[PDB]
Amino acid sequence: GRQKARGAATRARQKQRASLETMDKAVQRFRLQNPDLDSEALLTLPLLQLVQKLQSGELSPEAVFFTYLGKAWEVNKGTNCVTSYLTDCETQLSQAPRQGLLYGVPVSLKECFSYKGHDSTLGLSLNEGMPSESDCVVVQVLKLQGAVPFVHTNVPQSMFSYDCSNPLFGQTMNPWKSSKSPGGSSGGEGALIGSGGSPLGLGTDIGGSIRFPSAFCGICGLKPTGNRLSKSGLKGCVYGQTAVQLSLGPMARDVESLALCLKALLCEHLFTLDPTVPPLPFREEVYRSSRPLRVGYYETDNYTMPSPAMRRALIETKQRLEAAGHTLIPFLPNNIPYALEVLSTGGLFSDGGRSFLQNFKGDFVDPCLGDLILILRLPSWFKRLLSLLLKPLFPRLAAFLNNMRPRSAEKLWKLQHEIEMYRQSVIAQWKAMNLDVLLTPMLGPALDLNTPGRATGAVSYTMLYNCLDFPAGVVPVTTVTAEDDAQMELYKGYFGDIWDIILKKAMKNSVGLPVAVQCVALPWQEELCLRFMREVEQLMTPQKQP
Amino acid sequence: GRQKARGAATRARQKQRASLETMDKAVQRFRLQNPDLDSEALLTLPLLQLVQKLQSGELSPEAVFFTYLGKAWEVNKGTNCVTSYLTDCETQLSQAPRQGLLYGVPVSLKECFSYKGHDSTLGLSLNEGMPSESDCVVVQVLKLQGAVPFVHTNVPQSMFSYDCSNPLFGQTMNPWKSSKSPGGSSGGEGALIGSGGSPLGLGTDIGGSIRFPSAFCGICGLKPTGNRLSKSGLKGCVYGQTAVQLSLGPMARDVESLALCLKALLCEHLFTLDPTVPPLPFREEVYRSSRPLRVGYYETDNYTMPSPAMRRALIETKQRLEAAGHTLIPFLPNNIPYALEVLSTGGLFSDGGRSFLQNFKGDFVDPCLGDLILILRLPSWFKRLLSLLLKPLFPRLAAFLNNMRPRSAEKLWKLQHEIEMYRQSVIAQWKAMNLDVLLTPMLGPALDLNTPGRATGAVSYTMLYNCLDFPAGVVPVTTVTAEDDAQMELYKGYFGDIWDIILKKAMKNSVGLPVAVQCVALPWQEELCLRFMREVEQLMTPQKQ
Numbered sequence A: 001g002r003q004k005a006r007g008a009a010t011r012a013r014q015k016q017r018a019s020l021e022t023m024d025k026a027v028q029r030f031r032l033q034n035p036d037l038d039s040e041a042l043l044t045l046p047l048l049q050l051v052q053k054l055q056s057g058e059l060s061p062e063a064v065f066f067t068y069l070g071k072a073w074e075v076n077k078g079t080n081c082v083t084s085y086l087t088d089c090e091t092q093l094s095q096a097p098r099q100g101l102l103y104g105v106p107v108s109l110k111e112c113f114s115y116k117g118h119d120s121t122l123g124l125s126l127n128e129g130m131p132s133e134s135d136c137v138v139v140q141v142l143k144l145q146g147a148v149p150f151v152h153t154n155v156p157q158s159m160f161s162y163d164c165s166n167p168l169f170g171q172t173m174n175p176w177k178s179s180k181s182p183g184g185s186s187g188g189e190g191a192l193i194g195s196g197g198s199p200l201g202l203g204t205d206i207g208g209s210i211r212f213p214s215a216f217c218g219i220c221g222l223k224p225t226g227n228r229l230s231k232s233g234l235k236g237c238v239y240g241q242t243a244v245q246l247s248l249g250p251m252a253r254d255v256e257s258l259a260l261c262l263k264a265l266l267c268e269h270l271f272t273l274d275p276t277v278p279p280l281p282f283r284e285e286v287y288r289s290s291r292p293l294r295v296g297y298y299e300t301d302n303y304t305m306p307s308p309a310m311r312r313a314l315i316e317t318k319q320r321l322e323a324a325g326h327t328l329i330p331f332l333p334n335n336i337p338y339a340l341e342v343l344s345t346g347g348l349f350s351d352g353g354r355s356f357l358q359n360f361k362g363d364f365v366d367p368c369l370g371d372l373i374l375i376l377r378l379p380s381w382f383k384r385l386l387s388l389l390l391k392p393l394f395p396r397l398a399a400f401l402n403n404m405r406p407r408s409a410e411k412l413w414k415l416q417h418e419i420e421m422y423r424q425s426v427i428a429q430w431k432a433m434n435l436d437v438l439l440t441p442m443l444g445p446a447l448d449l450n451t452p453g454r455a456t457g458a459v460s461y462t463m464l465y466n467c468l469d470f471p472a473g474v475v476p477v478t479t480v481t482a483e484d485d486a487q488m489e490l491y492k493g494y495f496g497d498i499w500d501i502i503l504k505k506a507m508k509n510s511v512g513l514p515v516a517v518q519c520v521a522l523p524w525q526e527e528l529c530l531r532f533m534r535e536v537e538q539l540m541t542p543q544k545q546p
Numbered sequence B: 001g002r003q004k005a006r007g008a009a010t011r012a013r014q015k016q017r018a019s020l021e022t023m024d025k026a027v028q029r030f031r032l033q034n035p036d037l038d039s040e041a042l043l044t045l046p047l048l049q050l051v052q053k054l055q056s057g058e059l060s061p062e063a064v065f066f067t068y069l070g071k072a073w074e075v076n077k078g079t080n081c082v083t084s085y086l087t088d089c090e091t092q093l094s095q096a097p098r099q100g101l102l103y104g105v106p107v108s109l110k111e112c113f114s115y116k117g118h119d120s121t122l123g124l125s126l127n128e129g130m131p132s133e134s135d136c137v138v139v140q141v142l143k144l145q146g147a148v149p150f151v152h153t154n155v156p157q158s159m160f161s162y163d164c165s166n167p168l169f170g171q172t173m174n175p176w177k178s179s180k181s182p183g184g185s186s187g188g189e190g191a192l193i194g195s196g197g198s199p200l201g202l203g204t205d206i207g208g209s210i211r212f213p214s215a216f217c218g219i220c221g222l223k224p225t226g227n228r229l230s231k232s233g234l235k236g237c238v239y240g241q242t243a244v245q246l247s248l249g250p251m252a253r254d255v256e257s258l259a260l261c262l263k264a265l266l267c268e269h270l271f272t273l274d275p276t277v278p279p280l281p282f283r284e285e286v287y288r289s290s291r292p293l294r295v296g297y298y299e300t301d302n303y304t305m306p307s308p309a310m311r312r313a314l315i316e317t318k319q320r321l322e323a324a325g326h327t328l329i330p331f332l333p334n335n336i337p338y339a340l341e342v343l344s345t346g347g348l349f350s351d352g353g354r355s356f357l358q359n360f361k362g363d364f365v366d367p368c369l370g371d372l373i374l375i376l377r378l379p380s381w382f383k384r385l386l387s388l389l390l391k392p393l394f395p396r397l398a399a400f401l402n403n404m405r406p407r408s409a410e411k412l413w414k415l416q417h418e419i420e421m422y423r424q425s426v427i428a429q430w431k432a433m434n435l436d437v438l439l440t441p442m443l444g445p446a447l448d449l450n451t452p453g454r455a456t457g458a459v460s461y462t463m464l465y466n467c468l469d470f471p472a473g474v475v476p477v478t479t480v481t482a483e484d485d486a487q488m489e490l491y492k493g494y495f496g497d498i499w500d501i502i503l504k505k506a507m508k509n510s511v512g513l514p515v516a517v518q519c520v521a522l523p524w525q526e527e528l529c530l531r532f533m534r535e536v537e538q539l540m541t542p543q544k545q
């Protein structure tokens, strides 16, 4: 019953292997012609400096491209983050618009960004051997801005996961520690950028998928408001689900790179190619503002107990912000359990998971997905019964289960209205404290491979802002200390259910791993969100190369 | 029983009566203090000039307010367009922010715009005696811009109608001809502005409700992209339906008034009050552009046969645009029947009408709603049965019935995806022809009272653009001639079903009534849409500029 799936995996692995061999050949050829090039100097240039040298002609696009291609090939050896080499990029390299804001910049793409002539498998057998007819809109815009998309990077099967394995290309590993997850679903991006193999990448995010891998791999990422950028041509598993919007956004080694990428994407090219996106230009004056901020903050969401490292990261950032003249205001969005258990879960699974499950018919189920598939497949009556039985002992598990049941269109309208009202509730709460931005913990350090799928509760920090559709980004601010790690041994969680128990084991042995915080602003305020992220970066990593 | 509904109607009529009496008292008081004021001259000033004189101090806010209030009271006698006088407006009058872009401008509000202390009944007994506890966001913004919202205007019961009667406040009449509908659901606004009793109003639109009353009453109206303006605080019958977007927008005597209103609303106040609205400022340079346009056009949607007056309006406008140097290109959105019958109907009635019907429990059903409520109440299995029977001879009726059935969330996702793909498909057509804007017929002339409810097919010209969620506005360009009207005797419709039969009769006896065209641009291009409307208005009715 898996002959088709086995065939798909065999071919996918052949293509991946052939891609990597092609990259290696091209790199060797370039190095042989350019033996004196200082590759290390080039790779360590911050993106903004790299862009400046490309624009001035101090570095050639060829030098930058083949040097990054070599590094990407090398870091892939230990991470398995690359699924495909975007072959025609060497021609794009030659024709990159000279005055483009990203002229000559190699860019990595999550596998779901459609690219002409390439599959977007999402790790699913049913999508193998179905090459895209054309580049998606954001890829078109990247190219019009002179960038050179060069690889597709790995995702967990279906993308519905914050780990990163599928049965076609296998498992992506965290470059900091091979036993750890790079996070997900933009996990290949996190591993590649996090190890220096790409200066800039695009990911997508519906429950944290830009923010998890950025945090786990020690890089920066921004999830804009859902409709700030075009989703035209993004390959997905479920279509027409609009209660919880998908978002796409940049990942990079610093905040300034995110801002440049957003600025480059928010151009007339994008707005003309996809008229459904509001034509809101990047407001430079907001991004570059240096006014003191009113910063809401919380040390915990009272849902996922923060690791000791997460809490310390949050408190230290709060303290540095206060020392820098900002006003820090205790603030926690109301009714988080509702937002997660009813609104988010219900929005994602209004149909009981039937549409999602069609993708898995005849396919293997990657171990990183845990019991998700088995649970979604349960009859609605059984989900309900099991929920009732679990409720007295494990209310959180019971709540998720009950809200993953199929329902009528009538009930979906009701849910959609509740989502709208909840958004207005939190906005009103925010305005009552006159906040500018909000600082929150971000899940970390990286969990062991194959554990995100058994720690669903831990999406609480990120998924809240998908439900609310507020821009949210993450910035690395510290690393796990011996003390942080020792204190983790005493971690209990608020619920004591299997999700709390797994998280504790999954974060074992994390000394030295990166830990982030999350920065949030109101809908459409990506510029202000990035301004705040820049502040955090300046205060918590003061030696970060300009 | 009906004692609940009767009681609500009694109370509503008493409140309306008391409002009008309060207006009368205020107007007479003011007039006695200002016997020399040239009220006719004030009432006939185009809004832009009225605003200039208010801003300079040449006209006082009081003179403008009470003069319009008097006109509104007078025109209401023959139209019954006013449901409530927004009593506290005389206090807003004295506190209007002096540098506001609408300083001193009286503004009328469709009844669904929540206004503190007043009902938004929607003509439904269940909402009577339930006053709003805060102004809706756009009303707050109007006030912050110095405008003076002064009346709530009538809507058809539930607003799901392009006529304008409900059992609480009764029936609104077209000011051009008392036997005619003023259109709807923003019909009170249409009648009030159309008769000179307000220089600017706000309406809402999910299947044409800004555009029908504007066209039927001979005024201008714009339905923006759904999320260009804040819908916070708008009272409705159904919530959480997002497949077919609700929009709100201005209605006024000329295009410049719509542009001023949009410019005033699209300000920091709005964007801060409702962060969910993208903070897109009004792009003055786009609105003011005089560059030649590539204008797609169609003279019929092949779904609703246009009236002779509609077709002449379209052709004459096309010809004037050509003479003015614009490029006119035939264009028709693909699969219109699918967009209307499957996507629009399905989106509006995904739950079989159950949520909507709850509003009518224990209430009279206004005759202007025709058989809608009777039909919606039928069991899904029966809607399906009747659909099969009707299909051979009357495919249009069968299709509507079939697509008004309840369905699962799974099916609604599928439908929502189809709406997204359809929107991109029309965008792709538009781009392939390199269009700037699109010119279409607009339903007209006004239908006889109580007929819109029995001519559902005729929403085709407008509903398409709610489905697509493109900005669309209407501009009056001509009036029905006796020649046009006599030609209605040759009108057959494309289907010959009951909707065509009703529409034929309903559009007769319309000599002298206004007829519009519709102007469309891509999502978020309200300024371009307005630039085009301004062009049409200038070419067809130069005296308005």
Ligand SMILES: O=C(CCCCCCc1ccccc1)c1nnc(-c2ccccn2)o1
Pocket: A112, A158, A159, A160, A161, A162, A185, A204, A205, A206, A207, A208, A209, A234, A235, A236, A237, A246, A344, A345, A348, A400, A456, A459
């Ligand atoms: O689905 C996800 C992320 C899932 C993150 C974990 C959710 C875990 C969870 C949440 C609620 C209930 C149960 C499990 C996703 N990330 N990216 C995409 C995506 C989808 C379509 C096109 C492009 N990207 O989808």
Ligand SMILES: O=C(CCCCCCc1ccccc1)c1nnc(-c2ccccn2)o1
Pocket: B112, B158, B159, B160, B161, B162, B185, B204, B205, B206, B207, B208, B209, B234, B235, B236, B237, B246, B344, B345, B348, B400, B456, B459
């Ligand atoms: O419902 C409508 C207009 C309905 C116009 C006639 C539709 C006729 C039709 C269409 C498709 C199938 C059956 C009948 C409406 N107009 N304004 C509103 C409205 C709704 C909520 C808040 C504010 N305004 O709603």
Ligand SMILES: CCCCCCCCCCCCO
Pocket: B114, B120, B130, B131, B132, B133, B233, B234, B235, B236
């Ligand atoms: C739905 C927004 C408009 C509501 C108009 C009627 C308000 C009655 C009082 C409501 C108080 C808050 O629930």
Ligand SMILES: [Cl-]
Pocket: A015, A084, A117, A118, A119, A131
């Ligand atoms: Cl491929």
Ligand SMILES: [Cl-]
Pocket: A227, A278, B227, B278
């Ligand atoms: Cl939007």
Ligand SMILES: [Cl-]
Pocket: B370, B371, B453, B454, B455
């Ligand atoms: Cl009928």
Ligand SMILES: [F-]
Pocket: A184, A185, A204, A205, A206, A207, A208, A209, A210
């Ligand atoms: F996600």
Ligand SMILES: [F-]
Pocket: B184, B185, B204, B205, B206, B207, B208, B209, B210
């Ligand atoms: F409407």
